[PDB]
Amino acid sequence: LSDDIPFRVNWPGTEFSLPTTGVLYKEDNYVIMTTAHKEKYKCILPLVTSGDEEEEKDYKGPNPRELLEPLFKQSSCSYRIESYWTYEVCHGKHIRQYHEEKETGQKINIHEYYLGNMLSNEIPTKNIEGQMTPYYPVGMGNGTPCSLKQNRPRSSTVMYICHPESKHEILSVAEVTTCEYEVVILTPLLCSHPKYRFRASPVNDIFCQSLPGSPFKPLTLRQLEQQEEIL
Amino acid sequence: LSDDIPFRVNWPGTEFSLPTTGVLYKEDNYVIMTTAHKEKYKCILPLVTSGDEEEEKDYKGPNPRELLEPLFKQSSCSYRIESYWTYEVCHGKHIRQYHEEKETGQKINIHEYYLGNMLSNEIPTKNIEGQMTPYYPVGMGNGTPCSLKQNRPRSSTVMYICHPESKHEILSVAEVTTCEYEVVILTPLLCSHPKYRFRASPVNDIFCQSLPGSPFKPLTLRQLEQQEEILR
């Protein structure tokens, strides 16, 4: 029932005009209010729609291909630890997965596989954690042959998702078919474009007016706010 | 040797001259010290003497009664509660020892006992809690007769010992003999006179010279210094 709709109550004071842009504010939706210390408040709410995409999405920047160029040139790679295998992922060079077999004392066996090698108006959108978000797909293959596919080189696609606290790490590992896997990578630079930014619903603000004879906002959250400040 | 003499660590740096006033500094009681990060410190120690009293005790202040007259004329006096009794002392006026018995509903009996009324090159000194401190007494007598001694009227001695934070409070009450009493009062005033101030032992400072190639302040202490004040 639309859990992800945000709200926030503010106290603009006594005299205030309902904004027109964005959401619309009516008058019959008003609510009588009284506090424990006999303060009379008159509060109003908007219609919770937050529909359409009239955010004036103007982007004069180029395509996101140049954004990931420094990652390719840097050649600094991260790793990911799984239950058995170790998926080592690099952008621009290859994607390799291996499992270490530590023999007793002298040698260490290696079981290394090769995922692949690298020698439109509606942007595609994938569902991650139940949420719809755009992503930029890439295509590469020419990996180690698989007997299940009759000596067919593997192919995989790298997924790009933004996160402000990401360090080019791997979120999860999944496969679409035998010898056909998919790698999810969190890059913090791709979302700078408004189209590629994280799909966050804009906040819808509720103002609750304070009529004269009472202060602009109620009296207990004062001492609550100094208390939270000195703790 | 004891738990009286205090010490303080000082870091003057590299250049420092041994003071010839106060404690005495000799060149034999030095220690070369190396800390964890390989800085060298030359720490010199003061001689633990703390002797004599050549503090130039020369003050032209008023008489001892001058600092006591305003307190006696204040007419605002304190109380104290004991296990059974409650000794109320009113400086310059009288001391009342009593206990209020609360009968079941109507009577409130007060068992009053009267402690009295009012109508030298070496200052005498008294020991409290193992520390020897000079005071100012108030001789006083002619209380209520004490029946154990064929009705000799009681006596009481008012003991004055100052304390920088004070509210004219009673620290202790004593019974040196039956029906002869000794009560003490702590006030922040009378030790402006030369002798009745608490005898603080001089703080024997120790200096840790910083040899060349090392900072005048160790790094761990340097960070702990601002750590305390930001956490203050």
Binding site: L1, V9, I32, C43, V48, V176, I206, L231 | -
Partner: protein
């Protein structure tokens, strides 16, 4: 004329406190209603908080809301809270979260700890507001302080969390709670071997002397009381260490859930039996309403319990076309708090199409989140079947084969279904091999 109402309310309170009998409780409730007939506030709210829930008075939702109107016009600190509760989950009234927000915030304005708990929970897990750290943490501390105030004195009554469907985030610290755990389990094993009387041989048990095992489990329950009391004290203390700045560095995301655990145990969590008892003898119309308050407060157990009894369409207030969306809502809330079975229930919700449209991709992602995080063979087998028949994504065999194998060694009881499934898969493969 108010003195008579005060006397009646005092008599009802005395009857309720001195006697826990059902008839005495009913008489006290009737006296409280008589006192509230002249609009006396305290007994009015006392009968209000049970009349709506039931198991004390008949459940009259519409009269409850009409009463709550004037209760809130008076300025009752606890009247705002339940009215916002009712308006939140669409209980007998159209649902909208903004008026519920203002009502809840003015209840917490008046000092109601239920309302501070509510504000802290809905700010923490971003429902009705934007997700944040500071506000939820502050509102949670404002209730947890009083929680320990009750725990340190009364002893902190221990309640048994029952489910009707039945950094440093690994343990939120170590040490003291671990040794509480070993102490409790040593006490349990001691009491259990104390009950043993198989080597009696005309003695020991004293020929059905029940008067020794009753005290044994009574002492066990009292030690349980003490041990979980110490557990809660320790957890609040580590929450305050992790909270402000000290011991370990500033860490909101490993402090708020510890605070929430401390508040969750608390004293409000006695309505759990008041609702489970109501459910156990019919009375399915009171279970969802007593559970909804605790599921607005944020209880994972209450969230899953209310959702389970809604999923089987026995709630009578909600329309039968609305029970499925609400149950989906509350199961998703239980999923947000990490309750495993809610994830598989949500996946089936997206799978057979309960409430929401049939969409296999969503079902697959809930099944996968249930699989690799909680290591649950149920949803994982379900997604193995997804690969097996080929819904949503491409069709093959070897994938589903290896997840069936991992289901085989994942849980000891999963020996037989995967075997049947593998037999069916092998039969299909052999028929295809025959067809090839």
């Amino acid at each position: 004329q108010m003195q008579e109402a005060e006397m009646m309310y005092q008599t009802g309170m005395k009857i309720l406190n001195g006697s826990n009998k059902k008839s005495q409780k009913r008489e006290a409730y009737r006296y409280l209603q008589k006192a509230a007939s002249m609009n006396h506030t305290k007994a009015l709210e006392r009968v209000s908080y049970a009349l709506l829930f039931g198991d004390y008075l008949p459940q009259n939702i519409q009269a409850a809301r009409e009463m709550f109107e004037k209760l809130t016009e008076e300025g009752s600190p606890k009247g705002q809270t339940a009215l916002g509760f009712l308006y939140a989950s669409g209980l007998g009234v159209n649902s909208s979260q903004a008026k519920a927000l203002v009502y809840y915030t003015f209840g917490a304005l008046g000092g109601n700890l239920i309302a501070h708990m509510v504000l802290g929970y809905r700010y923490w897990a971003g429902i009705g507001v934007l997700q944040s750290c500071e506000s939820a943490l502050t509102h949670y501390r404002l209730v947890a302080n009083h929680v320990a105030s009750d725990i340190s004195l009364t002893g902190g009554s221990v309640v048994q969390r029952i489910r009707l469907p039945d950094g440093m985030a690994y343990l939120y610290g170590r040490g003291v709670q671990v040794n509480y755990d070993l102490a409790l389990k040593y006490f349990q094993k001691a009491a259990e071997q104390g009950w043993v009387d198989g080597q009696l041989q005309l003695g020991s048990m004293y020929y059905n002397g029940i008067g020794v095992k009753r005290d044994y489990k009574q002492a066990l329950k009292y030690f349980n009381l003490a041990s979980q009391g110490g557990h809660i004290l320790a957890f609040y203390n580590l929450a305050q260490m992790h909270a402000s700045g000290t011991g370990v560095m500033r860490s909101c995301h490993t402090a708020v859930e510890l605070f929430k655990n401390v508040c969750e145990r608390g004293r409000w969590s006695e309505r759990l039996m008041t609702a489970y008892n109501s459910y156990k003898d019919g009375d399915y119309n009171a279970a969802v309403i007593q559970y909804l308050l605790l599921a607005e407060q944020g209880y994972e157990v209450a969230q899953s319990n209310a959702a389970f009894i809604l999923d089987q369409r026995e709630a009578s207030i909600v329309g039968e076309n609305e029970t499925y969306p609400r149950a989906l809502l509350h199961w998703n809330r239980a999923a947000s708090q990490g309750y495993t079975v809610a994830r598989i229930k949500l996946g089936d919700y997206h799978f057979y199409g309960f409430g929401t449209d049939v969409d296999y991709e969503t079902a697959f992602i809930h099944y996968r989140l249930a699989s690799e995080q909680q290591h649950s063979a149920q949803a994982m087998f379900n997604l193995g079947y997804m690969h097996e028949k080929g819904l949503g994504i491409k069709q093959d065999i070897h994938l589903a084969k290896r997840f069936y194998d991992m289901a085989a060694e994942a849980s000891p009881d999963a020996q037989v279904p995967v075997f049947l499934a593998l037999c069916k898969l092998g039969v299909v493969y052999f028929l295809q091999y025959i067809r090839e």
